[PDB]
Nucleic acid binder design. Structure first.
Ligand SMILES: Nc1ncnc2c1ncn2[C@H]1CC[C@@H](COP(=O)(O)OP(=O)(O)OP(=O)(O)O)O1
Ligand SMILES: [Mg+2]
Ligand SMILES: [Mg+2]
Ligand SMILES: [Mg+2]
Lengths: 667, 105
DNA sequence: TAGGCACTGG
DNA sequence: CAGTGCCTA
């Protein structure tokens, strides 16, 4: 087993030079440094470990070091270098599994001050290395009276960078052994720093193997990216902006501007009593000025500095100010002294003036248009800001970012694109599609295969209650579509409203609000649905008794054996089902890709298919041809059945596949 | 004898009026405004026939003030045959006000 | 009853 | 940086 890390000139997307690398070899217990001209030797050493059936440990090597080295070997040495997935260990992937209850900075992309909770020390240091190295570089420059240019610390190799490289390997080694000491994941009777790769995966907990395969595959998904219709989103932007302007023009005519105190420095005191008046706006007392003096101030004559403010429809404060003035008396306030002003209350606000009453609708339309503009074009994480030169958006994925085992998505978050049923969703959704990628050889657009696990968490529920109802629920489920069967009973409007209902219920007011009624309907429905399935109570009880006693144990055992932290006794059932769903989906996407590869299909734009996105229980796959799209859909269904059998699931698991040009059509 | 203006009457009452007109831009929430108000009532009566005292509450009439670039209140704007002759901001005393008027009238 | 992220106001 | 509120599963 060896531990390694490299320093290079840029992020994966534009890296062109290997600066240095460090290797720690457990069999010699020595650290070896490799400088720029040693690149060839660095690679030789890595492949030698691979030849021994050994293991290579990197911190975040799955997304960076490994891909980066393949790229740099080709560019710098015209060499083909591809470390096998089975020979690589990643301490970040490991930490995210073991300390699934803790957040991390995602290797410096997130500011640690903003993260909630504690942070594992070693991983923290590793994530802060780039920033620390940068700070050293700058001060060292300014020390030499030299100017600093953003990102210059990475253009050239230097012994400072070399020293940080060695430090990363020392810390990574320490992190590794700390993770390896967790007996729940690694049997204490085995020294995992002294075994071959085959042993490492087979002897450690299944979760360890699953998370590494997931990180390897998702790293590939990130590099593929999601083909994006830039031109279409720019045209959408123009349309949304004009409507925004028009709504602003209408609203600023209905709700005129006003003045507000601003800039006041001194406290206003009663001119007779001296009594400080905190509530009154702060004033300013001119020191110079008199009565010919053209100036407009007079020493000792106090005035209240003010500012002119135009109605900003994006301001909840402005909205609230104008509506109360129009006679609106709020009913619900924020636990911080402020009237709640969300779409739901806006929908219920009634005033006398018909023009202002109608303006409420314009305000709602305006807020929404802003939500789309912000997400699509103006926000810091806007799609138009993320589309790369290859015409794709390469969103990042933390394979195990959620406590339950679910993954998280950011930069931008491709798991929060507006749905087709919401305003402008069809245009948004249609912009993300395989059709927007032209084959590198034929120039023909690719096709999209979208597959979604069917009634996933309701089936996980059926699985877990099987020992209480002997499978009655699981059986009742495969009798038509449960969600459609729900909507009917619940007498719900949409199949989505029926899903949001059943999941809100399974995990009275909130229920009523989601269903569109009051706490009364919420109650009635809550009982009619609980009475229908009584074993749900038994499952809950059994869960509570196992965890609570003041905890008896504050974690639940996931499908692959890992510990799943339980935040609260009330969220226990949800933790159990969402984790099951997450883990089922995770092994599922791993098996689906493995099966396609065993069938002879190549993963990549230069191949036959490319994973573009994984949104919890759905995958969107780009396919070179319709036939491949059909194979992908059928294969995904087989992989799901394989997963269900793999973990002896008590409810049959299924998938639904759709073939089309983009996300609008494939979900 | 104070003239209470509105956005819609301002043009003919102030700009198209004859003689000097003192306009006070104020707000009910301003301490200084509340301070000079009493003073203005006395000026209005004292300067009868020689000056007209008008008041415009900027909250009830939001359109006028901006056209004059108000940045603080109370703002005393003196108009002479359609235009601003002098301007003073702040809670002047009766004495300081009388001086401002006399010297400017 | 898992997450990311935008916009306002201090 | 915090308080709010919306987007997704
Ligand atoms: N509002 C929600 N609250 C909690 N969990 C949810 C919610 N929406 C979805 N989930 C969970 C449970 C199901 C899982 C995947 O979402 P999805 O909506 O596809 O599941 P589903 O089984 O309801 O639908 P389908 O059968 O149409 O695929 O995510
Ligand atoms: Mg690194
Ligand atoms: Mg589902
Ligand atoms: Mg889904």
């Amino acid at each position: 087993m060896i531990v390694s890390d490299i320093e290079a000139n840029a992020l994966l997307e534009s890296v062109t030079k290997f600066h240095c690398g460090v290797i720690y070899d457990y069999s010699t217990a020595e650290y070896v440094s490799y400088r720029p001209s040693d690149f060839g030797a660095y690679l030789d050493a890595l492949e030698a470990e691979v030849a021994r059936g050994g293991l290579i440990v990197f911190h975040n090597g799955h997304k960076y070091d490994v891909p980066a080295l393949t790229k740099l070997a080709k560019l710098q040495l015209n060499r083909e270098f591809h470390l096998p997935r089975e020979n690589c260990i990643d301490t970040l992937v490991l930490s995210r599994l073991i300390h699934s209850n803790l957040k991390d900075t995602d290797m410096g992309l997130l500011r640690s001050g903003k993260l909630p909770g504690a942070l594992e020390a070693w991983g923290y240091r590793l994530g802060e290395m780039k920033g620390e190295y940068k700070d050293d570089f700058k001060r060292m420059l300014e020390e030499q009276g030299e100017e600093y240019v953003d990102g210059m610390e990475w253009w050239n190799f230097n012994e400072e960078m070399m020293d940080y490289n060695v430090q990363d390997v020392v810390v990574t080694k320490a992190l590794l052994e700390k993770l390896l000491s967790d007996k729940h994941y690694f049997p204490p009777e085995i020294d995992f720093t002294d075994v071959g790769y085959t042993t490492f995966w087979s002897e450690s907990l299944e979760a360890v193997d699953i998370e590494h395969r997931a990180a390897w595959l998702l790293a590939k998904q990130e590099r593929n990216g999601f083909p994006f219709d830039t031109k279409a989103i720019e045209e959408l932007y123009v349309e949304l902006a004009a409507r925004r302007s028009e709504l602003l023009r209408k609203l600023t005519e209905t709700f005129g501007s006003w003045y507000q105190p601003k800039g006041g420095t001194e406290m206003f005191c009663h001119p007779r009593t001296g009594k400080p008046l905190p509530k009154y706006p702060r004033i300013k007392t001119p020191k110079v000025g008199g009565i010919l003096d053209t100036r407009e101030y007079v020493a000792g004559a106090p005035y209240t500095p003010v500012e002119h403010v135009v109605f900003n429809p994006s301001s909840r404060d402005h909205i609230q100010k104008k509506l109360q003035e129009a006679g609106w008396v709020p009913t619900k306030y924020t636990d911080k002294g402020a009237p709640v002003v969300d779409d739901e209350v806006l929908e219920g606000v009634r005033v006398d003036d018909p023009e202002k009453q109608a303006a409420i609708d314009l305000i709602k339309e305006y807020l929404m248009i802003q939500k789309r503009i912000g997400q699509s074009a103006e926000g810091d994480k806007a799609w138009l800001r993320y589309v790369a030169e290859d015409g794709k958006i390469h969103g990042s994925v933390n394979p195990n970012g959620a406590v339950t085992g679910r993954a998280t998505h950011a930069f931008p978050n491709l798991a929060q694109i507006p749905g087709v049923r919401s305003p402008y969703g069809e245009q948004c959704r249609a912009a993300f599609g395989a059709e927007h990628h032209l084959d590198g050889i034929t120039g023909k657009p690719w096709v999209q295969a979208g597959i979604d696990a069917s009634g996933l968490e309701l089936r996980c529920l059926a699985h877990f209650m099987a020992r209480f109802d002997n499978g009655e629920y699981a059986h009742e489920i495969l009798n038509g579509d449960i969600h459609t069967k729900n909507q009917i009973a619940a007498e719900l409007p949409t199949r989505d409203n029926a899903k949001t209902f059943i999941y809100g219920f399974l995990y009275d007011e909130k229920i009523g609000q989601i269903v569109g009624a009051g706490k009364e309907r919420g109650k009635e429905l809550k009982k009619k649905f609980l009475e229908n399935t009584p074993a749900i109570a038994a499952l809950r009880e059994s869960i509570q008794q196992t965890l609570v006693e003041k905890w008896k144990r504050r974690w639940i055992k996931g499908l692959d054996g890992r510990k799943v932290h339980v935040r609260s006794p009330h969220a226990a059932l949800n933790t159990l089902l969402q984790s099951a769903g997450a883990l089922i989906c995770k092994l599922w996407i791993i098996k689906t890709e493995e099966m396609l590869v065993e069938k002879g299909l190549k993963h990549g734009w230069d191949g036959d298919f490319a994973y573009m996105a994984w949104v919890h229980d759905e995958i969107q796959v780009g396919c070179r041809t319709e036939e491949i799209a059909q194979v992908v859909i059928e294969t995904a269904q087989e992989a799901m059945r394989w997963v269900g059998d793999h973990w002896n699931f008590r409810c049959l698991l299924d998938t639904e596949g759709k073939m089309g040009p983009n996300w609008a059509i494939c979900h | 004898k104070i003239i209470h203006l509105t956005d819609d009457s301002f043009d003919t009452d102030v700009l198209k009026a004859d003689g000097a007109i003192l306009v006070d831009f104020w707000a009910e929430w301003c301490g200084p405004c509340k301070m000079i108000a009493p003073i203005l009532d006395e000026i209005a009566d004292e300067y009868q026939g020689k000056l007209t005292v008008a008041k415009l509450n900027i909250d009830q009439n939001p359109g006028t003030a901006p056209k004059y670039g108000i940045r603080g209140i109370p703002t005393l704007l003196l108009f002479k045959n359609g235009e601003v002759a002098a301007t003073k901001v702040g809670a002047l005393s009766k004495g300081q006000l009388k001086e401002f008027l006399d010297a400017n009238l």
